[PDB]
Amino acid sequence: SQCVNFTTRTQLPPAYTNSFTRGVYYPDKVFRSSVLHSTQDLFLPFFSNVTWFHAIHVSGGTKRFANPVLPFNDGVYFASTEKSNIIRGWIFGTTLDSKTQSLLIVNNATNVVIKVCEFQFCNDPFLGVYYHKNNKSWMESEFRVYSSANNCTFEYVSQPFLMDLFKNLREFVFKNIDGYFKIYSKHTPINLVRGLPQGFSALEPLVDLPIGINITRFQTLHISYLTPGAGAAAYYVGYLQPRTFLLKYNENGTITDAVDCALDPLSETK
Amino acid sequence: VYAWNRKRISNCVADYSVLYNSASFSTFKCYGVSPTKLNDLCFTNVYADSFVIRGDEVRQIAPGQTGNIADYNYKLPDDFTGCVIAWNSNNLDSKVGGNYNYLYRLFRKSNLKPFERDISTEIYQAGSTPCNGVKGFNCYFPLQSYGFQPTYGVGYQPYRVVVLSFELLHAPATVCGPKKSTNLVKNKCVNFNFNGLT
Amino acid sequence: VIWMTQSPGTLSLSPGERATLSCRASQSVSSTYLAWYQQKPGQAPRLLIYGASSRATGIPDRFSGSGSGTDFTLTISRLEPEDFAVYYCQHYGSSPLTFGQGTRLEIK
Amino acid sequence: EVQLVESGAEVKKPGSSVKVSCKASGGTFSSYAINWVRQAPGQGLEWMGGIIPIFRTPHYAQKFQGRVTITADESTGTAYMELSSLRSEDTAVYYCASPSCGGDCPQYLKSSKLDWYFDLWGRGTLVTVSS
Ligand SMILES: *[C@@H]1O[C@H](CO)[C@@H](O)[C@H](O)[C@H]1NC(C)=O
Ligand SMILES: *[C@@H]1O[C@H](CO)[C@@H](O)[C@H](O)[C@H]1NC(C)=O
Ligand SMILES: *[C@@H]1O[C@H](CO)[C@@H](O)[C@H](O)[C@H]1NC(C)=O
């Protein structure tokens, strides 16, 4: 599709948050019952410095608030808190142009689309929906994310569904290792209004794909609500590191709690 | 054949046995692999190259071949690793008045490299004087028609050819053969293999 | 169509004499597209000259061609007894390819 | 060795057709420039037409258009000239002739093809047309 040009480009300054004890995810598909297992892998270290930003979905009023492209390193913990599903997709790669193979992930209203091609992303990739007054339902009508898509290397479309248009915290972990791009996901109802909730949660495995591409940077994509003319989503990003972790599988195999060995000497003893 | 179609196949299981037992194949030649072993192999990508030629030109689609089809229309590498399937389409691609829609490249300065497609219609310069887009003496249209008819000989009858090429790179494989699965056995010492876990 | 006109129609000469035959095209032609032939009675034509001046393989040095545009010549510098024959010019640069009517070379 | 050999002599009636053959030997027949030239008794040379078999596009002199058909069989290395609606004026010796490449010798790009001989005129077949 053809990109839409915005005269004004702006981005909110980053802020910092305490990761608390989140980012724990099933390192493998193994089933363990009532047992402690020590695994050495890429995790978000406990109480890490998480870079967090805001995601504005409505303009009201000609300023385009641009999400910033951020480095990837060895994998990221991306959390999003919002009422309606404002966050829609992400873009990954090295140069994010037709020169190098680049990935686009999106969960639109219809189905989940993941495409690895030499995309030429827009300066401000745009997802626009309008309220159908007669049908009393918001309906997606604008999708301008990449100007071009050539030499497509991979594509994957989930079954078509309907996305709805007390907050929801959706946590995701993206790790590209050994030519495999693995996405872990977890969905929770959060009553906290602002700031990362403090507590434990296991991010279930969601999908592993053998796309086998080199990725070093990424950017987040938000929805735009077209209105005739304040609840901006909040998204936090942390970076994984190679750490040793002690995971406590309960009877059913759900990760009840984890210990970060290198956090503090008490954890070393643990 | 000069504009032979190519489709890329990946991220799917290739069922070779049923594919090879579907129709009656007048020509089935695989090089570098047996037809049965493909059910056991994984490859990065698959390429399906489809076209139509004459019967007598079918021999041109093989490694190390030469000829009009081999040199100017479709070229295979000498080390080709893949399969070639060809079957008569006289009841499909032949017309009473002649099926002239199928074309082939006749004049070309140099032979095609393997898996190189030439769709140029520029007037071929067969003499010293330039053609300047004008066909005439020493200036001929590079493409020639087949004009298949149902009453032609099988050598002149149309033949549909599909070349299956197996690209195996140092990347995670996307296409594999069919997985077999035996019946389950319980309460007995057995040699199990669940989803590759032995 | 380009027409070729030879002159003379008959030439009578003795062995040892020089022969010169003329061929005129109805319009200007490239010299690259002019040939000369000898024909003996009951034999096929034999190429002597191509490209107005290039001698064919195994033709004697006494034979030479020249000219350009409309006007071409065949010269035989010293006639031998085997040279008494009919000679034809040809334009071969476009269809139809055309011959002259011939010049008959006879012993005087 | 490169040679042209015509079919034997023919005797025909006016209004009928004649088909003469020229067998070429030596080199690749598909790229062989075969020309037909006739000579009536006591007359000059007349080019009738020719073909290079690979292009399947025969050329004819305007005088013979609609009466002459030139074809080539690549499997036998043989060119044919058919002349229809015969007249007494079609009594002639019919030669096949292929000067190296006929009308496609000068090609100094695609390949070499810088060969030009002088011994490629068939001896000729006599066609007699009489009532
Ligand atoms: C994160 O780093 C900034 C400076 O880079 C610092 O001001 C802030 O306190 C840090 N956050 C935590 C939780 O230590
Ligand atoms: C896509 O790949 C082909 C060959 O694989 C290449 O010729 C072409 O330039 C590529 N596309 C772009 C936009 O570079
Ligand atoms: C395990 O799951 C069962 C049902 O699937 C449930 O009744 C039970 O409470 C669960 N136990 C734990 C410790 O999660």
Numbering used by the authors:
A (entry chain B): 13 to 72, 75 to 179, 186 to 249, 257 to 297
B (entry chain A): 347 to 544
C (entry chain L): 1 to 108
D (entry chain H): 1 to 131
Per the authors:
S is the major surface glycoprotein on the SARS-CoV-2 virion and is involved in viral attachment to target cells via the interaction of cell-surface-expressed angiotensin-converting enzyme 2 (ACE2) with the receptor binding site, at the tip of the receptor binding domain (RBD), in the S1 fragment of S (Lan et al., 2020). Following attachment, cleavage of S releases S1, allowing a major conformational change in S2, exposing a hydrophobic loop that executes fusion of viral and host cell membranes, releasing the viral genome to initiate viral replication (Walls et al., 2017). In-depth structure-and-function analyses of 27 potent RBD-binding mAbs isolated from vaccinated volunteers following breakthrough Omicron-BA.1 infection reveals that they are focused in two main clusters within the RBD, with potent right-shoulder antibodies showing increased prevalence. In summary, we have presented a structure-function analysis of potent human antibodies induced by Omicron BA.1 breakthrough infection in SARS-CoV-2 vaccinated individuals.
We have determined structures for five mAbs within the neck/left shoulder cluster: Omi-2, -9, -12, −25, and −42. Omi-2 belongs to the IGHV1-69 gene family but has features in common with Omi-12, the only member of the IGHV1-58 gene family found in the set of 28 potent antibodies. In particular, Omi-2 and Omi-12 have a disulphide bond and Pro and Phe residues at the same positions in the H3 loop which mediate interactions with F486 of the RBD; these commonalities appear to drive Omi-2 to adopt almost exactly the same pose as Omi-12, which differs from the other potent antibodies that bind in this region. The second, right shoulder, cluster was seen in the full set of early pandemic antibodies, above the S309 site. This region is occupied by 5 of the 6 IGHV1-69 mAbs; the other, Omi-2, lies within the neck/left-shoulder cluster. Interestingly the exception to this binding pattern is Omi-2 which binds in the other major cluster. Mutations are mapped onto Omi-2 (which has the longest H3 loop). (I) cryo-EM maps for complexes of Omi-2, -38 and −42 with Beta S (shown in gray), RBD in cyan and Fab in purple.
